[PDB]
């Protein structure tokens, strides 16, 4: 199937409590594989998946050095952002960054990404052409002009089409037993009376990987989107995910309702119903 690699950075200022904290995490698909935390007793890029542990000391030392440099860059960026927004040095602010590459089932670059935010709002994004920028406001336009003058997009393009894809392919091979294995959902429907004339039907999907899934209820074959309570997909802690979808139905009409499950690990979509037995 398709695969992606993403790095996520969070830089958080905290005046009076030291320099801004910098946390970086890396993911392949829904599997985290590295972390770095400037607040750690000894900050280092550290493995978070078994298949990355085989990388040598040059990998770990170099990623640690690079993440330390990135932390310094983002501390500077926090100071710059204060200037661009006319903000005081007393408040706490957050810069976030996400970047990486998507491969199609073929294995070639499908597209690249590099997006930044300030205080939870879009700030600047590399366009899909990997050559131009979209700035969210007049401050980000200052950054855009600077990055155009410095030809930053060309370096990002080179990284996203080269090293990003090459390393993602390496990880997918080294982690193939997990990264290239889809675990289908284990599914079932529960029934919980609400009153003498209504009952909740809850369709459960458990133990699935990757996280992407579709759970829907139909009544008489029509989607019940506006009447379905759908919880956010949530991590189980063993790499897998969980989700449920629930509808409240008139007692005696339960068999008119069907739950439909789509997941990459299923050869065909599942249809299930409440089974009183």
């Amino acid at each position: 199937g398709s695969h992606s690699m993403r790095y996520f950075y969070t830089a958080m200022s905290r005046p009076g409590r030291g320099e801004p904290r910098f946390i970086a995490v890396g993911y392949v698909d829904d599997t985290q594989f590295v972390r770095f935390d400037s607040d750690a007793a000894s900050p280092r890029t550290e493995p978070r998946a078994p298949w990355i542990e085989q990388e040598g000391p040059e990998y770990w030392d170099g990623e640690t050095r690079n993440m330390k440099a990135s932390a310094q860059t983002y501390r500077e960026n926090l100071r710059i952002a204060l200037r661009y927004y006319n903000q005081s040095e007393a408040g706490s602010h957050i810069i976030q960054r996400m970047y990486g590459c998507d491969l199609g089932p073929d294995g070639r670059l499908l597209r690249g990404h590099d997006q930044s935010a300030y205080d939870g709002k879009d700030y600047i994004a590399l366009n899909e052409d990997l050559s131009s920028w979209t700035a969210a406001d007049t401050a980000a336009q200052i950054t855009q002009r600077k990055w155009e003058a410095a030809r930053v997009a060309e370096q990002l393009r080179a990284y996203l089409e080269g090293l990003c894809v090459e390393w993602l392919r390496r990880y997918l091979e080294n982690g193939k037993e997990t990264l290239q294995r889809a675990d289908p959902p284990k599914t079932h429907v529960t029934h919980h009376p609400v009153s003498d004339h209504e009952a909740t039907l809850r369709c459960w999907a458990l133990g699935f990987y990757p996280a992407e899934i579709t759970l829907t209820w139909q009544r008489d074959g029509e989607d019940q989107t506006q009447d379905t309570e759908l919880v956010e997909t949530r991590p189980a802690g063993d790499r897998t995910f969980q989700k449920w979808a629930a509808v409240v139905v008139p007692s005696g009409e339960e068999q008119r309702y069907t739950c439909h499950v789509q997941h990459e690990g299923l050869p065909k979509p599942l249809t299930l119903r409440w089974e009183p037995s």
């Binding site: 790095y7 970086a24 890396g26 990998y59 990623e63 690079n66 993440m67 440099a69 990135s70 860059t73 500077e76 960026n77 710059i80 952002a81 661009y84 970047y99 950054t143 600077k146 990055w147 410095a150 930053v152 370096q155 990002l156 990284y159 090293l163 990003c164 390393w167």
Partner: peptide
């Protein structure tokens, strides 16, 4: 492997 920063905001 992570991107090497070279420019600020």
């Amino acid at each position: 492997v992570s991107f090497i920063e070279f420019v600020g905001w």
